[PDB]
Design an enzyme around this catalytic site. Sequence first.
Site, short mmCIF file in Angstrom:
data_model
loop_
_atom_site.label_atom_id
_atom_site.label_comp_id
_atom_site.label_asym_id
_atom_site.label_seq_id
_atom_site.Cartn_x
_atom_site.Cartn_y
_atom_site.Cartn_z
N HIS A 126 -3.15 55.52 0.88
CA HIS A 126 -3.90 55.49 2.12
C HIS A 126 -3.01 55.80 3.32
O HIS A 126 -3.33 56.66 4.13
CB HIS A 126 -4.58 54.13 2.30
CG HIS A 126 -5.47 54.05 3.51
ND1 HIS A 126 -6.80 53.69 3.42
CD2 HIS A 126 -5.23 54.28 4.82
CE1 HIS A 126 -7.34 53.70 4.63
NE2 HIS A 126 -6.41 54.06 5.50
N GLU A 168 -2.97 59.41 5.52
CA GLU A 168 -3.23 59.41 6.96
C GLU A 168 -2.12 60.14 7.72
O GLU A 168 -2.39 60.93 8.63
CB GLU A 168 -3.34 57.98 7.48
CG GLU A 168 -3.44 57.91 9.00
CD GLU A 168 -4.72 58.57 9.52
OE1 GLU A 168 -4.77 58.88 10.74
OE2 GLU A 168 -5.66 58.76 8.72
N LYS A 210 -2.11 63.97 7.10
CA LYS A 210 -3.18 64.65 7.83
C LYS A 210 -2.78 64.96 9.26
O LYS A 210 -3.03 66.06 9.74
CB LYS A 210 -4.46 63.81 7.83
CG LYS A 210 -5.40 64.14 6.67
CD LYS A 210 -6.20 62.92 6.19
CE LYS A 210 -7.15 62.38 7.26
NZ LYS A 210 -7.88 61.18 6.77
N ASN A 211 -2.16 64.00 9.94
CA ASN A 211 -1.74 64.20 11.32
C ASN A 211 -0.60 65.20 11.40
O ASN A 211 -0.61 66.08 12.25
CB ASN A 211 -1.31 62.88 11.97
CG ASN A 211 -2.40 61.83 11.93
OD1 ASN A 211 -3.58 62.16 11.98
ND2 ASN A 211 -2.02 60.56 11.86
#
Lengths: 358, 358
Positions: B227, B231, B234-235
């Site tokens: 998780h 995250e 992705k950024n």
Amino acid sequence: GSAPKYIEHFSKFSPSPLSMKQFLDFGSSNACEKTSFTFLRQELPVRLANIMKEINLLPDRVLSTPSVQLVQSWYVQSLLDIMEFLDKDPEDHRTLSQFTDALVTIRNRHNDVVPTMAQGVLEYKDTYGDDPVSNQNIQYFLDRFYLSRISIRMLINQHTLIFDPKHIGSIDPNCNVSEVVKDAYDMAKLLCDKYYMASPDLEIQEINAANSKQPIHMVYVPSHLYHMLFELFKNAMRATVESHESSLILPPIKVMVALGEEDLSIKMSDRGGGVPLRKIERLFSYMYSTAPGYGLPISRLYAKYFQGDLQLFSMEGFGTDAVIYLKALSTDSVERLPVYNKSAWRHYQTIQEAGDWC
Amino acid sequence: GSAPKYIEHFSKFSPSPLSMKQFLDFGSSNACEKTSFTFLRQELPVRLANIMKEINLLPDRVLSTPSVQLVQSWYVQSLLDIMEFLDKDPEDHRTLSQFTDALVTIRNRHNDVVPTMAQGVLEYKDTYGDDPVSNQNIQYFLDRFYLSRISIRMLINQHTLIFDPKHIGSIDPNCNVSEVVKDAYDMAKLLCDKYYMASPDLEIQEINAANSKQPIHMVYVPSHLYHMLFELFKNAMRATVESHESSLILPPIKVMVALGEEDLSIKMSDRGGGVPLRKIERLFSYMYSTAPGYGLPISRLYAKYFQGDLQLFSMEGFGTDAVIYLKALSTDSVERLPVYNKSAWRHYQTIQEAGDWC
Ligand SMILES: CC(C)c1ccc(COc2ccc(CC(=O)NCCN)cc2Cl)cc1
Ligand SMILES: CC(C)c1ccc(COc2ccc(CC(=O)NCCN)cc2Cl)cc1
């Protein structure tokens, strides 16, 4: 016998933060010192009084210590020294002259404030202990006290250096960051070689985002930048050398200077072995870092002084990254000053005994 | 009509944090579910009640909102659902069976807690505004609420997955960090290619300090690690792609996995242009990051859950470093749980109006 009155009087005023732009003006070239004298006659007493009012708000077990009473007396004396000019008039090139003399003498008087206060911390640790709440209050008070001092010394240095041109006092409107990085590195290396007879090399790389290959310059107080970089190079070298005294390769310290739209950042990366996350937090504490120095915490204050910051993050088992964040624009460079309030009054009311997490 | 009584009763208890070591035990292989049932019959009500007591301590303008009342009702229902077993006896392989059923149903009931609460934040922003003090309270409450939830879901997942072997429920005692890094990267890349028809590559490097070339493994909850990494990837991809859509080189995302004596750190470095220091602070705020997601703040909670952390630091004009700090040893991996106290009671008394700095 009227120091308490004055302190009470001037503590009612809020110190006035100056921008790097305003500093250039006050220092212009012909901006008479009369303007500086009339401004400083009021501002210095305001800043002195504000931090003095806060010092008197410390617990009696801290106040009565020889160290705190000693510097508290230097401040009192410095305050009275400046009062002497309130009812004096510029125009007389003797009034201004003795004012400059007055400032230099004040500056010397306070030259040993840091170590003197550090002696108070050591005393407190053995006299009362090193609990987290004591650490928090010491941390809270010293950050404000030292930052306040840094700003008073700025005002004074600006006045004395100018009213004795490419540099405007301690400010270089065309400071080449990389040049200051090298200077600090060179000094650190010199010391590093004397003690370890070995030192890592330096690699510098800069990223001018908007202007690819143009050298990175900024309006800043170079000595402040030097102080921070020197402190960081010392730790990076020591860690690198000690973590490799059984290896023969000694990795270099890599420094990146990046210029963004609003940030001018300086990262110093070392492969000095790193430090566990839990000890990092203690590296910035005046108390936890006192024995039986204050380079990091104080360097961070110099960075915060003009709205910047200084942070650390390492990788245990590898190395550490230290970053100095400065404002790229002179318009965003404004003094960060602490002020006496009921807001600050309530920050010393910590009554810890059982937290909110288990 | 006795939910308030129960909440008051169980809120008097302090939740009991389990270590990664204890989790392995409860999940052993033959450690009967009776032990887990008797433990969970008490622990879940304690955790539920503790966060419920805090929710009822929120301002009425926040409490009466449809969103908060809705999840506050799921919690009430979940609490009563579990009560049903206090005066029940293990031994009966039907009691245990319906308990598992009870947990899965509770889990589903709460599946949309995050977005539902996010709706409450958006409502509050338009209904009362986005001042710093509102941000601080929202931040304070949501970190505790969400972290509390993460831990309840852990307990439940452990019980249901095991009482349905190399994996102990959601825990992998031999988690290969780099393998999880690749997995998360691969998923991010897939999405990145669909939307941008371009994606940066991945470079992984690990530093096993004590054992140079031995693969780095740890006892951890792989889905939690996934998780967080997902995250961050992705950024890092978005920033890298968007900051280079007029350049043709697309720099890779470099990830370092370092294993120290107590820290197991994961750094993800990108050359996505970076972000100014002032906006970084807002990237972790539930409020400032709500419109018209919560990946970062919530990912940080997953890291804090087992005594780790997640930090960001970029260089405007260059890129950003994101680091996930985990405890290397299973003995140091103990649940971080929030608790209801007068300490926590006083954290919602903010009466801001004029600070201590000027
Ligand atoms: C020498 C200098 C750096 C120094 C050394 C030591 C300290 C310690 O200062 C403390 C310690 C504890 C408390 C909490 C408390 O119990 N407050 C109520 C006290 N009446 C408040 C303060 Cl301001 C400050 C400054
Ligand atoms: C929907 C959820 C996430 C949510 C949305 C919004 C909030 C806002 O919560 C606030 C806002 C202001 C104050 C200060 C104050 O004035 N306190 C006194 C009030 N009597 C306290 C709290 Cl707990 C919490 C939770």
